[PDB]
Amino acid sequence: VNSFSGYLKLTDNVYIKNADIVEEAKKVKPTVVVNAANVYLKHGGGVAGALNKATNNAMQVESDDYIATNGPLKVGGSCVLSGHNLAKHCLHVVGPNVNKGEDIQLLKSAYENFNQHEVLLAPLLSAGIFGADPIHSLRVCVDTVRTNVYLAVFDKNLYDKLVSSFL
């Protein structure tokens, strides 16, 4: 038993909710919250901008030190950093950005990072400002992640479409 509440069960291991990932993280304090990161860990907008704002910019300060030491992530890659006030850890995962021309086949590689963590609270990867077909993102998630993933989907209309169209 875990602390996640109000989720629809899609599969043995994938759960979905019409909830604010920021508000959900603040309520649950999960072991891992996933950020929809870019390779520079520049948390300007979308999920990343919202998570970073909720940390009072501490996520960005930590991330700038990480990049100054290690250089950029790979598209499809990840790093584990602090979860600050939101979670124990933040798994920063880089899905491909369609609005930058990145290979959508890298979405499966992105979701494979989730398998290193037993339980995660996560954004549908490459949805919102990343612009990938979202329905597609949920299918890759279900077909790739084997650990227990709680997908907080804040956009309501989209939530209802994801549920209604789910095979």
Ligand X SMILES: O=S(=O)(Nc1nncs1)c1ccccc1
Q: Which residue has the tokens 């030491």?
A: 69
Are 61 and 42 in contact, with CB atoms under 8 Å apart? no
Q: Which is nearer to ligand X, 17 or 89 (CB)?
A: 17
Residues contacting residue 135 through CB under 8 Å, at least 6 positions apart: 161, 162, 165
Report the nearest approach of ligand X to the CB of residue 52 (Å). 11
| Residues contributing to the site for ligand X (CB under 6 A) | 20-22, 46-47, 50, 123, 128, 154-155
Q: Which is nearer to ligand X, 1 or 153 (CB)?
A: 153
Supply the Cα-derived Rg of the chain in whole angstroms: 14
CA–CA–CA angle 116, 111, 51 (5° rounding): 90
Report the nearest approach of ligand X to the CB of residue 19 (Å). 8
Report the nearest approach of ligand X to the CB of residue 68 (Å). 26
Q: Which is nearer to ligand X, 9 or 156 (CB)?
A: 156
